[PDB]
Amino acid sequence: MSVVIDYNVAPPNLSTLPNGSLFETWRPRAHVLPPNGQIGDPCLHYTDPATGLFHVGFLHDGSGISSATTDDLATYQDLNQGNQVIVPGGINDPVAVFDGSVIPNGINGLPTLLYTSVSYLPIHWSIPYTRGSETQSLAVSSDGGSNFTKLDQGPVIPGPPFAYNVTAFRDPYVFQNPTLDSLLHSKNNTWYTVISGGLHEKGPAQFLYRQYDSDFQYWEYLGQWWHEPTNSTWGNGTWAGRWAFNFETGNVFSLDEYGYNPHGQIFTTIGTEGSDLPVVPQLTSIHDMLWVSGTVSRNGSVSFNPNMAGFLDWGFSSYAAAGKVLPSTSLPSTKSGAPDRFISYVWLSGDLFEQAEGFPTNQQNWTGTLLLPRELRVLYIPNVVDNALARESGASWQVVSSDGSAGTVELQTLGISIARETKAALLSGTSFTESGRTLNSSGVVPFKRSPSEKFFVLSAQLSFPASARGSGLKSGFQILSSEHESTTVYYQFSNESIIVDRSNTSAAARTTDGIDSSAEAGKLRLFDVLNGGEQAIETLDLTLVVDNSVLEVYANGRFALSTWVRSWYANSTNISFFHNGVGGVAFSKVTVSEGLYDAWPDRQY
Amino acid sequence: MSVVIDYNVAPPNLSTLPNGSLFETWRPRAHVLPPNGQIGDPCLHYTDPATGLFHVGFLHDGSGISSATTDDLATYQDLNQGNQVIVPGGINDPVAVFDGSVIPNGINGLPTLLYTSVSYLPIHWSIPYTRGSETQSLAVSSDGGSNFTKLDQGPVIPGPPFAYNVTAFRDPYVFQNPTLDSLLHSKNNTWYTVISGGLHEKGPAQFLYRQYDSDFQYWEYLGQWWHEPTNSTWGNGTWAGRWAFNFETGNVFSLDEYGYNPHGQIFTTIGTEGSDLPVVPQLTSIHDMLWVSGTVSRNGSVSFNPNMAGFLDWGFSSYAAAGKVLPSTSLPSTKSGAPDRFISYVWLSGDLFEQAEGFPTNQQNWTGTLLLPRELRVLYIPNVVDNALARESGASWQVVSSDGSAGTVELQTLGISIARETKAALLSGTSFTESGRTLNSSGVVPFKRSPSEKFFVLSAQLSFPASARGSGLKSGFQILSSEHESTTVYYQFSNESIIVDRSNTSAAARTTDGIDSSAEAGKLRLFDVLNGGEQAIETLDLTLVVDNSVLEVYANGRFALSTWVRSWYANSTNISFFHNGVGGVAFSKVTVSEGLYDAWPDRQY
Numbered sequence A, B: 001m002s003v004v005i006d007y008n009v010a011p012p013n014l015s016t017l018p019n020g021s022l023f024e025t026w027r028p029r030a031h032v033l034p035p036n037g038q039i040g041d042p043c044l045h046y047t048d049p050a051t052g053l054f055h056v057g058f059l060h061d062g063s064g065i066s067s068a069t070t071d072d073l074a075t076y077q078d079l080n081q082g083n084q085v086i087v088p089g090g091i092n093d094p095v096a097v098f099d100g101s102v103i104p105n106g107i108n109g110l111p112t113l114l115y116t117s118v119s120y121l122p123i124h125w126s127i128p129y130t131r132g133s134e135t136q137s138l139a140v141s142s143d144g145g146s147n148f149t150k151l152d153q154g155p156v157i158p159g160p161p162f163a164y165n166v167t168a169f170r171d172p173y174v175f176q177n178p179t180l181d182s183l184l185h186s187k188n189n190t191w192y193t194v195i196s197g198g199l200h201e202k203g204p205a206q207f208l209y210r211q212y213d214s215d216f217q218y219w220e221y222l223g224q225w226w227h228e229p230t231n232s233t234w235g236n237g238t239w240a241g242r243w244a245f246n247f248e249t250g251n252v253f254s255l256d257e258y259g260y261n262p263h264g265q266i267f268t269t270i271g272t273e274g275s276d277l278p279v280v281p282q283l284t285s286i287h288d289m290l291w292v293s294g295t296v297s298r299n300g301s302v303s304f305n306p307n308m309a310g311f312l313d314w315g316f317s318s319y320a321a322a323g324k325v326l327p328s329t330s331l332p333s334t335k336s337g338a339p340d341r342f343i344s345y346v347w348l349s350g351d352l353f354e355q356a357e358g359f360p361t362n363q364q365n366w367t368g369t370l371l372l373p374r375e376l377r378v379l380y381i382p383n384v385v386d387n388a389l390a391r392e393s394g395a396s397w398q399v400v401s402s403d404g405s406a407g408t409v410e411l412q413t414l415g416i417s418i419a420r421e422t423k424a425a426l427l428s429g430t431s432f433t434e435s436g437r438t439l440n441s442s443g444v445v446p447f448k449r450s451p452s453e454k455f456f457v458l459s460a461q462l463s464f465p466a467s468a469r470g471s472g473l474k475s476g477f478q479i480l481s482s483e484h485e486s487t488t489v490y491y492q493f494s495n496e497s498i499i500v501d502r503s504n505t506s507a508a509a510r511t512t513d514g515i516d517s518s519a520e521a522g523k524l525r526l527f528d529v530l531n532g533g534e535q536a537i538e539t540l541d542l543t544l545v546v547d548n549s550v551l552e553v554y555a556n557g558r559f560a561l562s563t564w565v566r567s568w569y570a571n572s573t574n575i576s577f578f579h580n581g582v583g584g585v586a587f588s589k590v591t592v593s594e595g596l597y598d599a600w601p602d603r604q605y
């Protein structure tokens, strides 16, 4: 007959169930992930100039790269039924295919992938590097992006600069930039490539190259344009993790206030691989997903000089973001009226980067997802009170101007928001509002109405009184609640953090191994702001997207924290206000939009 | 019963015979070749410091490198029963293993092979080069030289210098040299490597490197220390072929008057790949085996500056020589009392570099041989008459001093002779002498006694009168003669050449395809010399070694010409004086030593 899963009945040890039986249990409907199996780093994204279609890529099942297309930046169509567009086992990549990026109009006017071809394993920053384990090779797709055919020749970058003792040398990221062109006297619209890694006994680095010939064959090395001492940190480690022991997945792009701009301010996103001391061999224990703003100067060699940094996503399991310029002329942008954008997809590892021992993987028959596509832009925060909170150095914002008479500053930071078409589609269900209210005493106050399924967007503003500052206040929402389970998301002033408490999230965690229930946290400063003569603590503007087990928490256009919320009971759908009674908090009207949408309309599962 | 070969009966079309049936027909007994099958370039030679044994290597059956040892530099023992000590099919060399050389005391004090690992074919100077087709990789033998184990890592030299459009990039030749050390301020006894090839639209070259680390991992590029314009030539092309379109098998070593000397004069041997115009794609039509003397200077970068050049062997099929320093402390040198030597083995291709269409290869079941080991040294020619013959520039000798009163000069050139232990062993048979005589009229004059087998050394001096100069004289010997066959070897003044006429050598060439009968030739100048007051044309001092089908012609300690003489009839063993009647010629007593010896005493075949 069939395998019988009834989510009103208590879970077994989930490891005892048949393979595939929990395929739908925690599976999102509005996120990019393959038809089944494991997803790794995103990469390979490009806009096809001939069609305007946006292609997304990701590592799949540890055997190369799979891909999908989108004509709206909301929904996707698989290429090759989800099967890889390039796989290991060639002359240059006999052991593995790691991340690569695409020159959309490359050799013969075709999408041209420059990627890390792997010949020797293991590879880790903590151990000696095997010579030639990572090279960079070319492949070209002449069939619309379903198959990237390896050029029948050796790698175009056959290793690091002479005698460099690299920790890593991978994830080539191709990009154009007119500011670099002027500084370096490059031909206009030269392609640059950064390769990510570092050097033993020195620290993490991005290795910079430029196209030497129009055939993409030779790549002139321009030095370690950005490097940091081993396990150093931006500021004192508060706002942007650590530079740690190795850089991965370096992206480079340039922004203004609306989106992507070639002449704009220059940013990079990187993963950093961290560790406690002493180092455990071959173990990266901390996977930080950072963004960094910087100025670019030259003294013989070009240099990127960070002036602020933060997290692109604060989630423990968030890492390895890959993004791409998406021009206004693309199919999605033409329909939505968007200007040029930089769209970034963060990876949410499904199994704690392969440390989640005993998770029911064969039952689920999939592992991991990408997060919602995110638009990156320069965000300005006006009318901020010029005080110590605003003026802190080594943080994730900087003062760009002053008004002495008003007593204020204008702050600059990285804007992070859900890509506009995806956001509209997430909100396309049916909506209802809960009335605003002030809470002063301790407890959870049920919503009058809660969603009946685990697929929703909750939006709300939280306004705090002056005395909340430095207090023991905790305020937010309890979600996915029933008598058996609950998840609490709250702001906490004591350490200026958004917290996701997962201690009670999953009844399955009580009966099964490998179901992480540890707290998640990200730093967020609410500044003192001036609005029509009166000073107040900045409003907390919250968006929670729950897509079955995938939780993404956005705040104030500049913050994201994402995690797994693997609730079991069909019942666990209630929402409540939460406040710990330390001070007062005023909640606006809360909007709940239920159902999301189907990001994979041509799949049945 | 058996396949019936009777060498008194006329040959069939040899291609019709059973496989292996002609295994012994033309097979040498005193030369280095594998137990069966094809031999290519020699390479890999080294003296094992722990044992004093000299190892020889050669490409075998187009699938890697085979090896043998010798404790006397006369006889050899196979390693692995003739099976390869290293074969293609690894990560770095999936398609082929080309030449390599050995640092005898390398990694872990073991013989360390640096060799060309091949990943893409075809490779030829005349066509576009496939990127990464040739890299240089390391292997180490920990079992006495029977197996060279590939290091489990990528190549240590993963391609040519940045953006160089090489014609070829192979045959790494490791060597030490104190003169380079001083010029470059290298650590004492630094290992150098030259790699051979050239650049498209520029010409042939040797790429020079030095050891950067004691682990042999990194090789610092020191430039094209020697290069020549495409298809240029030493002098006007008379004495040293052409530099042609590509250099192969570059060896570098240093000599004095006795043998090898680290502080001596610097020499290189190279193969050059030539062609008529227009170029036929993928065809090298001329394979020149050159030696070159040069001085080494520095102006920022080091440079080798040729001051004379010639052929190491004039044979059309002679090519690809590999040689090695053999110290006085070796097993062979200890027994013979030799000083440090440089021993070179020339390749004699068996099939015109794979152009010999229809040769009975499967019948023979072997292809090619190495030539006799040769000692190289600086040779001086005293008491030469200071005239235009001696003073010619762009030749294979140079004046090193003058005696104005005597009217003479002392010349310098490369000495080429059979290695001393091999020579003694070749002469170990039974000897007889033919009386000297003067010949004035035309014809062939039979020896009173000729050898009864096709295994002998014939030595003789030919003295010419003053009028021979510029005349139509031809004088020498007819060998391997009967009513059906003959081979004539003679000196000819009209173009100062030794000629081997093979028009009548092989009755099998009349019934079978692919049995070359074209003439062979090498230039040799006999100078005017002064000996006790009287001026005479220099004596022609000739040594002919016939080892079944392998003919090597030596003259005057400075000349060698080698070829195939594939006579059929058992009868074809007679020797005669030869003279064409143009002038007079005085032959000394001719010594004939018959039988040679068995260079492979632990083989039965």
Ligand SMILES: OC[C@H]1O[C@@](CO)(OC[C@@]2(O)O[C@H](CO)[C@@H](O)[C@@H]2O)[C@@H](O)[C@@H]1O
Pocket (backbone or CB within 6 Å): A040, A041, A059, A098, A099, A116, A121, A122, A123, A124, A125, A170, A171, A248, A249, A271, A273, A284, A319, A320
């Ligand atoms: O899967 C390869 C791909 O992932 C990244 C970032 O997640 O590398 C991570 C990692 O696990 O790869 C090796 C394992 O061999 C190890 O050093 C790292 O910790 C990215 O850089 C790669 O392209």
Ligand SMILES: OC[C@H]1O[C@@](CO)(OC[C@@]2(O)O[C@H](CO)[C@@H](O)[C@@H]2O)[C@@H](O)[C@@H]1O
Pocket (backbone or CB within 6 Å): B040, B041, B059, B098, B099, B116, B121, B122, B123, B124, B125, B170, B171, B248, B249, B271, B273, B284, B319, B320
């Ligand atoms: O067999 C490889 C070995 O031989 C040499 C010299 O004889 O190369 C000769 C040659 O035939 O190799 C390639 C064929 O792929 C072609 O370009 C040459 O003409 C030597 O350099 C190699 O190590």
Ligand SMILES: OC[C@H]1O[C@](O)(CO)[C@@H](O)[C@@H]1O
Pocket (backbone or CB within 6 Å): A125, A126, A127, A167, A198, A199, A200, A201, A202, A203, A204, A230, A245, A246, A279
């Ligand atoms: O830069 C990171 C590297 O630095 C070290 O301290 C020394 O190599 C290692 O722990 C690590 O591999």
Ligand SMILES: OC[C@H]1O[C@](O)(CO)[C@@H](O)[C@@H]1O
Pocket (backbone or CB within 6 Å): A416, A417, A418, A423, A459, A541, A543, A554, A555, A556, A557, A558, A559
């Ligand atoms: O925190 C930024 C978030 O704020 C919103 O604009 C709220 O409507 C969302 O679209 C965005 O993701």
Ligand SMILES: OC[C@H]1O[C@](O)(CO)[C@@H](O)[C@@H]1O
Pocket (backbone or CB within 6 Å): B125, B126, B127, B167, B198, B199, B200, B201, B202, B203, B204, B230, B245, B246, B279
């Ligand atoms: O240097 C040799 C090379 O030079 C050329 O003329 C141009 O590349 C070719 O015939 C040959 O490949």
Ligand SMILES: OC[C@H]1O[C@](O)(CO)[C@@H](O)[C@@H]1O
Pocket (backbone or CB within 6 Å): B416, B417, B418, B423, B459, B541, B543, B554, B555, B556, B557, B558, B559
């Ligand atoms: O041409 C040089 C030859 O001359 C000899 O010394 C003659 O006895 C040989 O040993 C040598 O090969």
Ligand code: NA
Pocket (backbone or CB within 6 Å): A287, A288, A289, A313, A314, A315, A316, A317, A318, A319
């Ligand atoms: Na993370």
Ligand code: NA
Pocket (backbone or CB within 6 Å): B287, B288, B289, B313, B314, B315, B316, B317, B318, B319
């Ligand atoms: Na030749």
